[PDB]
Coordinates of C-alpha atoms and ligand atoms in Angstrom, one line a residue:
Chain A
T6 CA -10.7 -126.9 -22.8
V7 CA -12.5 -123.5 -23.4
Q8 CA -15.9 -122.5 -22.0
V9 CA -17.5 -119.3 -23.4
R10 CA -20.8 -117.6 -22.6
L11 CA -23.3 -116.3 -25.0
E12 CA -26.4 -114.2 -24.7
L13 CA -29.3 -114.0 -27.2
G14 CA -32.3 -111.7 -26.9
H15 CA -35.2 -110.0 -28.5
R16 CA -37.7 -107.1 -27.9
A17 CA -41.2 -106.5 -29.2
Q18 CA -43.5 -103.6 -28.9
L19 CA -47.1 -102.9 -30.1
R20 CA -47.2 -100.5 -33.1
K21 CA -49.1 -97.4 -32.1
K22 CA -49.9 -96.8 -35.8
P23 CA -50.8 -100.1 -37.5
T24 CA -49.4 -100.2 -41.1
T25 CA -51.4 -100.8 -44.3
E26 CA -49.8 -104.2 -44.6
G27 CA -51.5 -105.2 -41.3
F28 CA -48.5 -105.4 -39.0
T29 CA -49.1 -104.5 -35.4
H30 CA -45.8 -105.1 -33.6
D31 CA -42.1 -104.1 -34.2
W32 CA -39.6 -106.7 -33.1
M33 CA -35.8 -106.9 -33.0
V34 CA -33.7 -110.0 -32.3
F35 CA -30.0 -109.5 -31.4
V36 CA -27.0 -111.7 -30.6
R37 CA -24.4 -109.8 -28.6
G38 CA -22.7 -112.5 -26.5
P39 CA -21.7 -112.0 -22.8
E40 CA -21.1 -108.7 -21.0
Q41 CA -18.4 -106.5 -22.6
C42 CA -16.8 -108.9 -25.1
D43 CA -16.1 -108.2 -28.7
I44 CA -17.5 -111.5 -30.1
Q45 CA -16.1 -110.7 -33.6
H46 CA -12.8 -112.0 -32.2
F47 CA -14.1 -115.6 -32.6
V48 CA -17.4 -115.2 -34.5
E49 CA -16.9 -114.7 -38.2
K50 CA -20.6 -113.8 -38.9
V51 CA -24.1 -114.5 -37.7
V52 CA -27.1 -115.9 -39.6
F53 CA -30.7 -115.0 -38.8
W54 CA -33.6 -117.1 -40.1
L55 CA -37.0 -115.4 -40.3
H56 CA -40.4 -116.7 -41.2
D57 CA -40.8 -117.1 -44.9
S58 CA -43.7 -114.7 -44.7
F59 CA -41.1 -112.0 -44.3
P60 CA -39.2 -110.9 -47.4
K61 CA -35.6 -112.1 -47.6
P62 CA -36.0 -114.9 -45.1
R63 CA -32.3 -115.3 -44.5
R64 CA -30.4 -112.3 -43.1
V65 CA -26.6 -112.2 -42.6
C66 CA -24.6 -109.9 -40.3
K67 CA -20.8 -110.1 -40.8
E68 CA -19.8 -107.5 -38.2
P69 CA -21.4 -106.6 -34.8
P70 CA -24.0 -105.7 -33.8
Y71 CA -25.8 -108.8 -35.1
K72 CA -29.5 -108.1 -35.4
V73 CA -32.8 -108.2 -37.3
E74 CA -35.1 -105.3 -36.8
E75 CA -38.5 -106.0 -38.4
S76 CA -42.2 -105.6 -38.1
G77 CA -45.0 -108.2 -38.1
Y78 CA -48.2 -109.4 -36.6
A79 CA -47.4 -112.8 -35.1
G80 CA -44.4 -114.7 -33.5
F81 CA -42.7 -117.9 -34.4
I82 CA -39.7 -120.1 -33.7
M83 CA -36.6 -118.3 -35.2
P84 CA -33.4 -120.4 -36.0
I85 CA -30.1 -118.6 -35.4
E86 CA -26.6 -119.7 -36.5
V87 CA -23.4 -118.4 -35.0
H88 CA -20.4 -119.4 -37.0
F89 CA -16.9 -119.1 -35.4
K90 CA -13.4 -119.0 -36.8
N91 CA -12.9 -122.4 -35.2
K92 CA -10.6 -124.8 -37.1
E93 CA -12.5 -127.9 -35.9
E94 CA -15.9 -128.8 -34.5
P95 CA -17.6 -126.9 -33.0
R96 CA -17.3 -124.7 -36.2
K97 CA -20.9 -123.5 -35.9
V98 CA -23.6 -123.4 -33.3
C99 CA -27.4 -123.5 -33.8
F100 CA -30.0 -122.0 -31.5
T101 CA -33.8 -122.1 -31.8
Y102 CA -34.9 -118.8 -30.3
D103 CA -38.6 -118.7 -29.3
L104 CA -39.5 -115.3 -30.8
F105 CA -42.8 -114.1 -29.3
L106 CA -44.6 -110.8 -29.3
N107 CA -46.5 -109.0 -26.6
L108 CA -50.3 -109.4 -26.9
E109 CA -53.1 -109.2 -24.3
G110 CA -52.3 -105.5 -24.1
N111 CA -49.5 -106.3 -21.7
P112 CA -46.3 -104.2 -21.6
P113 CA -43.9 -104.9 -24.5
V114 CA -42.0 -108.2 -24.3
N115 CA -38.3 -108.3 -23.7
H116 CA -36.4 -111.6 -23.5
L117 CA -32.8 -112.5 -22.7
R118 CA -31.5 -116.1 -22.8
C119 CA -28.0 -117.0 -21.6
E120 CA -26.2 -120.2 -22.9
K121 CA -22.8 -121.8 -22.4
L122 CA -20.6 -123.2 -25.2
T123 CA -17.5 -125.5 -25.3
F124 CA -14.5 -125.6 -27.5
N125 CA -11.7 -128.2 -27.4
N126 CA -8.0 -128.2 -28.5
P127 CA -7.5 -124.4 -28.6
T128 CA -4.2 -123.3 -30.1
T129 CA -2.0 -120.4 -28.9
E130 CA -3.5 -118.0 -31.4
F131 CA -7.0 -119.5 -30.6
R132 CA -6.4 -118.8 -26.9
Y133 CA -5.1 -115.3 -27.9
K134 CA -8.3 -114.4 -29.8
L135 CA -10.4 -115.9 -27.0
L136 CA -8.6 -113.8 -24.4
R137 CA -9.0 -110.8 -26.7
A138 CA -12.7 -111.5 -26.3
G139 CA -12.3 -112.5 -22.6
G140 CA -13.0 -116.2 -23.0
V141 CA -12.0 -118.4 -20.0
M142 CA -9.9 -121.5 -20.4
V143 CA -11.2 -124.4 -18.2
Chain B
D93 CA -34.6 -75.4 -42.6
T94 CA -31.2 -76.8 -41.7
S95 CA -31.4 -76.5 -37.8
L96 CA -34.1 -79.1 -37.3
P97 CA -32.0 -82.2 -38.0
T98 CA -29.5 -81.4 -35.3
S99 CA -32.3 -81.0 -32.7
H100 CA -32.9 -84.8 -32.8
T101 CA -36.5 -84.1 -32.0
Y102 CA -37.5 -87.6 -33.2
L103 CA -36.1 -88.9 -29.9
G104 CA -38.4 -86.8 -27.7
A105 CA -39.6 -83.3 -26.9
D106 CA -38.3 -82.6 -23.4
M107 CA -35.0 -83.9 -22.0
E108 CA -33.0 -82.6 -19.0
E109 CA -30.0 -80.6 -20.3
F110 CA -26.6 -80.2 -18.6
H111 CA -24.7 -77.1 -19.9
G112 CA -21.6 -77.7 -17.8
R113 CA -18.2 -78.6 -19.3
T114 CA -16.1 -81.5 -18.0
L115 CA -12.5 -81.4 -19.2
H116 CA -9.5 -83.5 -18.4
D117 CA -6.0 -81.9 -18.4
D118 CA -3.4 -83.3 -20.8
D119 CA -1.0 -86.2 -20.1
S120 CA -3.2 -87.1 -17.1
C121 CA -4.3 -90.7 -16.3
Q122 CA -8.0 -91.2 -15.9
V123 CA -10.3 -94.1 -15.3
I124 CA -13.3 -93.9 -17.6
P125 CA -16.3 -96.2 -18.2
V126 CA -16.7 -97.8 -21.7
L127 CA -19.9 -98.1 -23.6
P128 CA -20.1 -101.6 -25.0
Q129 CA -22.6 -100.9 -27.8
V130 CA -20.8 -97.9 -29.5
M131 CA -18.3 -98.8 -32.1
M132 CA -18.4 -95.4 -33.7
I133 CA -15.2 -93.4 -34.1
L134 CA -16.4 -90.3 -32.3
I135 CA -14.6 -87.1 -33.4
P136 CA -14.5 -84.1 -31.0
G137 CA -17.5 -81.9 -31.6
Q138 CA -19.6 -84.6 -33.2
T139 CA -23.0 -85.3 -31.6
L140 CA -23.7 -88.9 -30.4
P141 CA -27.3 -89.7 -29.7
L142 CA -28.0 -92.9 -27.8
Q143 CA -31.1 -94.9 -26.6
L144 CA -29.8 -97.3 -23.9
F145 CA -32.0 -100.3 -23.0
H146 CA -29.6 -102.6 -21.2
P147 CA -30.3 -103.1 -17.5
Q148 CA -26.7 -102.3 -16.5
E149 CA -26.0 -99.5 -19.0
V150 CA -29.0 -97.7 -17.6
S151 CA -27.3 -97.9 -14.1
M152 CA -24.0 -96.8 -15.6
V153 CA -25.5 -93.8 -17.3
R154 CA -27.4 -92.9 -14.1
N155 CA -24.1 -92.9 -12.2
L156 CA -22.5 -90.8 -15.0
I157 CA -25.3 -88.2 -14.8
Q158 CA -24.7 -88.3 -11.1
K159 CA -21.0 -87.7 -11.5
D160 CA -19.0 -86.2 -14.4
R161 CA -21.5 -87.0 -17.2
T162 CA -18.7 -88.5 -19.3
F163 CA -17.9 -91.9 -20.8
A164 CA -15.6 -93.3 -23.4
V165 CA -16.0 -94.7 -27.0
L166 CA -13.1 -96.8 -28.1
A167 CA -11.8 -96.5 -31.7
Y168 CA -12.6 -100.1 -32.4
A176 CA -8.4 -100.6 -28.9
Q177 CA -5.4 -98.3 -28.5
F178 CA -7.3 -95.0 -29.1
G179 CA -10.7 -93.6 -28.4
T180 CA -12.7 -90.5 -27.7
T181 CA -14.4 -89.2 -24.6
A182 CA -18.1 -88.3 -24.8
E183 CA -19.7 -85.8 -22.5
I184 CA -23.4 -86.1 -21.9
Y185 CA -25.5 -83.0 -22.5
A186 CA -29.1 -84.2 -22.8
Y187 CA -30.9 -86.8 -20.8
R188 CA -34.4 -88.3 -20.4
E189 CA -35.8 -91.5 -18.9
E190 CA -38.8 -93.5 -20.2
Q191 CA -40.4 -96.9 -19.7
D192 CA -40.2 -98.5 -23.1
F193 CA -40.1 -102.1 -24.3
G194 CA -41.0 -102.9 -20.7
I195 CA -37.6 -101.6 -19.5
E196 CA -36.1 -98.4 -18.0
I197 CA -34.9 -96.9 -21.3
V198 CA -32.6 -93.9 -21.2
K199 CA -32.4 -91.5 -24.1
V200 CA -29.3 -89.3 -24.1
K201 CA -27.3 -87.0 -26.3
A202 CA -23.5 -86.4 -25.9
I203 CA -20.7 -84.6 -27.6
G204 CA -17.2 -85.9 -28.4
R205 CA -14.7 -83.9 -26.3
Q206 CA -11.2 -85.3 -26.1
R207 CA -9.0 -87.9 -27.8
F208 CA -7.0 -90.3 -25.8
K209 CA -4.7 -93.4 -25.9
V210 CA -5.7 -96.6 -24.2
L211 CA -3.3 -97.9 -21.5
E212 CA -5.4 -100.7 -20.0
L213 CA -8.9 -102.2 -20.2
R214 CA -10.0 -103.8 -16.9
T215 CA -13.5 -105.3 -16.5
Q216 CA -15.7 -104.8 -13.4
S217 CA -18.1 -106.8 -11.3
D218 CA -21.1 -104.7 -12.5
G219 CA -19.8 -104.9 -16.1
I220 CA -18.6 -101.3 -16.4
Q221 CA -15.4 -101.8 -18.3
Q222 CA -13.0 -99.2 -17.0
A223 CA -10.3 -97.9 -19.3
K224 CA -7.0 -96.4 -18.1
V225 CA -7.0 -93.3 -20.3
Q226 CA -4.3 -90.9 -21.4
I227 CA -5.5 -87.6 -22.6
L228 CA -3.8 -86.7 -25.9
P229 CA -2.7 -83.1 -26.4
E230 CA -3.5 -80.6 -29.1
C231 CA -0.1 -79.4 -30.5
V232 CA -0.5 -75.7 -31.2
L233 CA 2.4 -74.2 -33.2
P234 CA 3.1 -70.5 -33.6
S235 CA 3.1 -68.8 -37.0
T236 CA 5.6 -70.4 -39.3
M237 CA 7.1 -66.8 -39.7
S238 CA 7.4 -66.5 -35.9
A239 CA 11.1 -67.6 -36.0
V240 CA 11.7 -65.7 -39.2
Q241 CA 10.4 -62.2 -38.6
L242 CA 11.6 -58.6 -38.4
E243 CA 10.5 -56.5 -35.4
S244 CA 10.2 -53.4 -37.6
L245 CA 7.5 -55.3 -39.5
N246 CA 5.6 -56.5 -36.5
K247 CA 3.1 -53.6 -37.2
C248 CA 2.3 -55.1 -40.7
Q249 CA 0.8 -58.4 -39.4
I250 CA -2.8 -57.3 -38.7
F251 CA -4.7 -56.5 -41.8
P252 CA -7.4 -53.8 -42.1
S253 CA -10.3 -56.1 -43.0
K254 CA -11.5 -59.3 -44.7
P255 CA -14.1 -58.1 -47.2
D260 CA -11.6 -59.0 -56.2
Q261 CA -12.5 -59.1 -52.5
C262 CA -12.3 -62.5 -50.9
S263 CA -10.5 -63.5 -54.2
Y264 CA -7.1 -63.1 -55.9
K265 CA -6.7 -59.6 -54.6
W266 CA -7.0 -60.1 -50.9
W267 CA -5.2 -63.4 -50.8
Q268 CA -2.3 -62.2 -53.0
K269 CA -1.9 -59.2 -50.6
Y270 CA -2.1 -61.6 -47.6
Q271 CA 0.6 -63.8 -49.0
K272 CA 2.8 -60.9 -49.9
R273 CA 2.4 -59.2 -46.4
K274 CA 2.3 -62.1 -43.9
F275 CA 5.0 -64.1 -45.7
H276 CA 7.4 -61.4 -46.7
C277 CA 10.2 -62.8 -44.7
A278 CA 10.4 -65.9 -46.9
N279 CA 13.1 -64.1 -48.8
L280 CA 15.2 -64.1 -45.6
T281 CA 15.2 -67.9 -45.8
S282 CA 15.9 -70.4 -48.6
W283 CA 12.2 -71.1 -49.2
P284 CA 9.7 -69.0 -51.2
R285 CA 6.6 -67.4 -49.8
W286 CA 4.2 -69.8 -51.6
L287 CA 5.9 -72.7 -49.8
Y288 CA 5.1 -71.1 -46.3
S289 CA 1.6 -70.6 -47.7
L290 CA 1.2 -74.4 -47.6
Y291 CA 1.8 -74.6 -43.9
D292 CA -0.4 -71.7 -42.8
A293 CA -3.6 -72.3 -41.0
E294 CA -5.5 -69.5 -42.6
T295 CA -4.8 -70.4 -46.2
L296 CA -5.5 -74.1 -45.6
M297 CA -8.8 -73.2 -43.9
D298 CA -9.7 -70.9 -46.8
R299 CA -9.1 -73.6 -49.3
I300 CA -11.1 -76.1 -47.3
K301 CA -13.9 -73.5 -47.1
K302 CA -13.8 -73.1 -50.8
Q303 CA -14.2 -76.9 -51.2
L304 CA -17.1 -76.9 -48.7
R305 CA -18.8 -74.0 -50.6
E306 CA -18.4 -76.0 -53.8
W307 CA -20.3 -78.7 -52.0
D308 CA -22.8 -76.3 -50.5
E309 CA -23.7 -73.2 -52.4
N310 CA -25.7 -72.0 -49.4
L311 CA -22.8 -72.3 -47.0
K312 CA -22.4 -69.5 -44.4
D313 CA -18.9 -68.5 -43.2
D314 CA -20.3 -68.1 -39.6
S315 CA -21.3 -71.8 -39.6
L316 CA -17.7 -72.9 -39.6
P317 CA -15.4 -72.5 -36.6
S318 CA -12.7 -69.9 -36.8
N319 CA -10.3 -72.0 -34.7
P320 CA -8.0 -74.2 -36.8
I321 CA -8.5 -77.1 -34.3
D322 CA -12.3 -77.0 -34.3
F323 CA -12.4 -76.3 -38.0
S324 CA -10.2 -79.3 -38.7
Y325 CA -12.2 -81.6 -36.4
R326 CA -15.5 -80.5 -38.1
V327 CA -14.0 -81.0 -41.6
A328 CA -12.8 -84.5 -40.6
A329 CA -16.3 -85.3 -39.1
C330 CA -18.0 -84.2 -42.4
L331 CA -15.8 -86.0 -44.8
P332 CA -17.0 -89.3 -46.5
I333 CA -14.0 -91.3 -45.5
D334 CA -13.3 -94.8 -44.2
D335 CA -12.2 -95.9 -40.7
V336 CA -8.4 -96.1 -41.3
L337 CA -8.3 -92.4 -42.4
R338 CA -10.4 -91.5 -39.4
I339 CA -7.9 -93.2 -37.1
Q340 CA -5.0 -91.4 -38.9
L341 CA -6.7 -88.0 -38.5
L342 CA -7.4 -88.6 -34.8
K343 CA -3.7 -89.7 -34.3
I344 CA -2.4 -86.4 -35.7
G345 CA -2.0 -83.9 -32.9
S346 CA -1.2 -80.8 -35.0
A347 CA -4.0 -78.8 -36.6
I348 CA -1.9 -77.9 -39.6
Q349 CA -1.2 -81.5 -40.3
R350 CA -4.8 -82.5 -40.0
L351 CA -5.8 -79.6 -42.4
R352 CA -3.2 -80.7 -45.0
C353 CA -4.4 -84.3 -44.7
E354 CA -8.0 -83.2 -45.1
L355 CA -7.1 -81.2 -48.2
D356 CA -5.2 -84.2 -49.7
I357 CA -8.2 -86.5 -49.0
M358 CA -10.7 -84.0 -50.5
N359 CA -8.5 -83.7 -53.7
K360 CA -8.1 -87.5 -54.0
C361 CA -11.6 -88.7 -53.1
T362 CA -13.9 -89.1 -56.1
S363 CA -16.8 -91.5 -55.4
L364 CA -18.3 -94.0 -52.9
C365 CA -19.1 -97.6 -53.7
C366 CA -21.0 -100.4 -52.1
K367 CA -19.0 -101.8 -49.2
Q368 CA -20.6 -105.2 -49.9
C369 CA -20.4 -105.3 -53.8
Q370 CA -17.1 -103.3 -53.7
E371 CA -17.5 -102.4 -57.5
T372 CA -20.9 -100.5 -57.6
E373 CA -20.8 -96.7 -57.4
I374 CA -23.6 -95.0 -55.4
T375 CA -22.6 -91.4 -55.3
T376 CA -19.9 -88.9 -56.2
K377 CA -18.4 -86.1 -54.0
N378 CA -19.7 -83.3 -56.2
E379 CA -23.4 -84.3 -55.4
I380 CA -22.9 -84.0 -51.7
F381 CA -25.0 -81.3 -50.0
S382 CA -25.6 -80.1 -46.4
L383 CA -29.1 -80.1 -44.9
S384 CA -27.7 -79.7 -41.4
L385 CA -25.6 -77.1 -39.6
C386 CA -23.5 -80.1 -38.2
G387 CA -22.5 -80.9 -41.8
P388 CA -23.3 -83.2 -44.7
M389 CA -22.7 -86.2 -42.4
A390 CA -24.3 -86.7 -39.0
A391 CA -25.1 -89.5 -36.6
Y392 CA -28.7 -90.6 -35.9
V393 CA -30.3 -93.4 -33.9
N394 CA -32.9 -95.8 -35.3
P395 CA -36.0 -96.6 -33.2
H396 CA -34.1 -99.5 -31.6
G397 CA -31.3 -97.3 -30.3
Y398 CA -28.5 -98.2 -32.8
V399 CA -26.5 -95.4 -34.4
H400 CA -25.9 -94.8 -38.1
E401 CA -23.7 -92.1 -39.8
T402 CA -25.9 -90.6 -42.5
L403 CA -24.6 -88.5 -45.4
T404 CA -27.0 -86.3 -47.4
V405 CA -26.9 -86.1 -51.2
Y406 CA -29.0 -84.7 -54.0
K407 CA -28.8 -87.9 -56.1
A408 CA -27.8 -91.6 -55.6
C409 CA -26.9 -94.3 -58.1
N410 CA -28.0 -97.9 -58.4
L411 CA -30.5 -97.5 -55.5
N412 CA -33.9 -99.1 -54.9
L413 CA -36.6 -98.3 -52.4
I414 CA -38.9 -100.4 -50.3
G415 CA -42.1 -99.3 -48.7
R416 CA -44.0 -96.1 -48.6
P417 CA -42.6 -92.8 -47.1
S418 CA -43.5 -92.4 -43.5
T419 CA -42.9 -89.7 -40.8
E420 CA -43.1 -91.9 -37.7
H421 CA -39.4 -91.5 -36.8
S422 CA -38.0 -89.3 -39.5
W423 CA -34.6 -87.8 -38.7
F424 CA -35.5 -84.7 -40.8
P425 CA -38.8 -83.1 -39.7
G426 CA -41.1 -82.3 -42.6
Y427 CA -39.6 -85.3 -44.6
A428 CA -40.8 -88.9 -45.0
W429 CA -38.3 -91.7 -45.3
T430 CA -38.2 -94.8 -47.5
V431 CA -35.7 -97.6 -46.8
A432 CA -33.1 -97.7 -49.7
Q433 CA -30.6 -100.3 -50.7
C434 CA -28.1 -101.0 -53.5
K435 CA -30.1 -102.8 -56.2
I436 CA -27.2 -105.1 -57.1
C437 CA -27.1 -106.7 -53.7
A438 CA -30.0 -105.1 -51.7
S439 CA -27.7 -104.1 -48.9
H440 CA -29.2 -101.3 -46.7
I441 CA -27.5 -98.2 -48.1
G442 CA -29.9 -95.6 -46.7
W443 CA -33.2 -93.9 -47.3
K444 CA -34.8 -91.4 -49.7
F445 CA -36.5 -88.4 -48.0
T446 CA -39.4 -86.7 -49.8
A447 CA -41.2 -83.5 -49.0
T448 CA -44.5 -83.7 -47.1
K449 CA -45.4 -80.2 -48.2
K450 CA -45.2 -79.0 -51.8
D451 CA -43.6 -75.5 -51.3
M452 CA -40.5 -76.9 -49.7
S453 CA -36.9 -76.8 -51.0
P454 CA -35.6 -79.4 -51.9
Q455 CA -38.4 -81.7 -53.0
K456 CA -36.3 -84.8 -52.4
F457 CA -32.9 -86.1 -51.3
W458 CA -31.1 -89.2 -50.1
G459 CA -29.3 -90.2 -46.9
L460 CA -26.7 -93.0 -47.0
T461 CA -25.2 -94.6 -44.0
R462 CA -21.4 -94.4 -43.9
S463 CA -21.3 -98.0 -42.4
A464 CA -22.3 -99.3 -45.9
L465 CA -20.2 -97.0 -48.1
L466 CA -16.6 -97.6 -49.3
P467 CA -14.7 -94.6 -50.5
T468 CA -12.7 -95.1 -53.7
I469 CA -9.9 -93.1 -55.3
Ligands
LIG501 O1 -35.0 -91.6 -41.8 C1 -35.1 -92.4 -40.8 C2 -35.4 -93.9 -40.8 C3 -35.4 -94.3 -39.3 C4 -36.7 -94.9 -38.9 C5 -36.6 -96.4 -39.3 N1 -35.2 -96.7 -39.1 S1 -34.5 -98.0 -39.7 O2 -35.0 -98.2 -41.0 O3 -33.1 -97.9 -39.5 N2 -35.0 -99.2 -38.8 C6 -36.0 -100.2 -39.2 C7 -35.5 -101.1 -40.2 C8 -36.5 -102.2 -40.6 N3 -37.7 -101.6 -41.1 C9 -38.7 -102.5 -41.6 C10 -38.2 -103.7 -42.4 N4 -39.2 -104.5 -43.1 C11 -39.8 -104.0 -44.2 O4 -39.5 -102.9 -44.7 C12 -40.8 -105.0 -44.9 C13 -41.1 -104.8 -46.2 C14 -42.0 -105.6 -46.8 C15 -42.6 -106.6 -46.1 C16 -42.3 -106.8 -44.8 C17 -43.0 -107.9 -44.0 C18 -43.0 -108.1 -42.6 N5 -43.8 -109.2 -42.4 C19 -44.1 -109.9 -41.3 C20 -44.9 -111.0 -41.3 C21 -45.3 -111.6 -40.0 O5 -45.4 -110.9 -39.0 N6 -45.4 -113.0 -40.0 C22 -45.7 -113.7 -38.8 C23 -46.6 -115.0 -39.0 C24 -45.7 -115.7 -38.0 C25 -44.6 -114.6 -38.3 C26 -45.4 -111.4 -42.6 C27 -45.1 -110.8 -43.7 C28 -44.2 -109.6 -43.7 N7 -43.7 -108.8 -44.6 C29 -41.4 -106.0 -44.1 C30 -38.3 -100.6 -40.1 C31 -37.3 -99.6 -39.7 C32 -34.4 -95.4 -39.0 C33 -35.1 -93.0 -38.6 O6 -35.0 -92.9 -37.4 N8 -35.1 -92.0 -39.5
LIG502 ZN1 -24.4 -103.7 -53.1

């Protein structure tokens, strides 16, 4: 069995100069995984789902860093898909990141959520790539 | 003006500066921290600006400024480049202790081991690679009686066929003592290769000053490699080469061969051609800049771009080039973020427009 950590996060800051479109905050969501691990060893790509109000609702990042820098006026629930090079399920993992912006004139919002994921039946090359990334076999 | 872009004023106005130099002797084993968010292949002499926001990277950079002001950037690894911090500033941004720094690539190295740490400061066991300096190719084939005729009166027809023919005839007169002609030895001479590379650069930039380029073959070669629109594999090959002459010859070969840059996503759409490249910065046509969120892009400046489309209205909120407003630009075929178009805020400014394309989205083609 293989047990690997992941870390999702986002930041949001009030725009000092509101734009003509009416946007008041700048927000960035990023998937980086745990501390000091090249996720690319086992993640083929990452998919970011944005509110349809944004143009190009579906963003794709095929190499790290995996991110979506954007501007807006309101938050939402943002789906994220992390697809691995796994040869069998789990081949993809879905998260529902609560993307929220800082209102109430508080200091800018910064959020980090840590999660744990499981893979089964790892092969020798699978274990090799996980150890390249630092994954731990349990 | 061409000095403004290198100032990186968009980051901030005042930042503590450290003018000291930290060097590591050759073939010496070191233990160096590794920055996790830098995948760039830092070349010696290239400026790396960063805006660290991670809770632990702030602590690591604080320890670095406390001691030795140096970290590592792996050639994402078996090779990497050390970066020496030279500008520093703290701020409270995004609700976090954010640290804005500027460093310079200093030394190449080979990776021996990568060991993690409890705090997360990945320590690399580092071997400092050397700079192989060779004497003149005529050093072994020389006549003492002619040692006087090795320093030439001046370097003023002039700066053309005359001076260079005389240079070849005088400094490589002993080729006849060997089985090889003088013009062969001319191909392994630092001065001639540097002059040819300078001719190519001047072809790129008609407003190029000789004083702007280093007179040292090593520094000149590193600057040339830093300013070429090339891929990652060639960057690694250039870093691996330890002899200045070999690097200069490789750079000349690349410059001769390279013709155009295509969309790294489409792979068949051309965006720009090497003849349209131009330098708006003393650093060179290509330089590294950070976006508002702290991530780094290598931008190359051109007069014109092909198959490009713009989004938004030019703004000067965080422009990398003062006096210019940026509009996000992308390849119209696929909309991938290729770069931006910079337009003049004033009307009496030269040029009135140009483009800056991120190297991370450009694929050179031959
Ligand atoms: O020259 C240089 C350059 C830089 C300075 C800048 N950089 S950068 O470009 O790299 N970084 C970033 C890259 C991203 N850029 C913006 C991207 N988006 C756009 O353009 C764009 C265009 C058209 C429409 C929209 C849009 C956003 N919407 C939000 C909402 C919303 O909130 N809905 C809520 C209701 C519940 C959810 C609704 C509709 C909507 N429509 C967005 C900003 C800059 C480097 C430098 O430092 N020097
Ligand atoms: Zn494209």
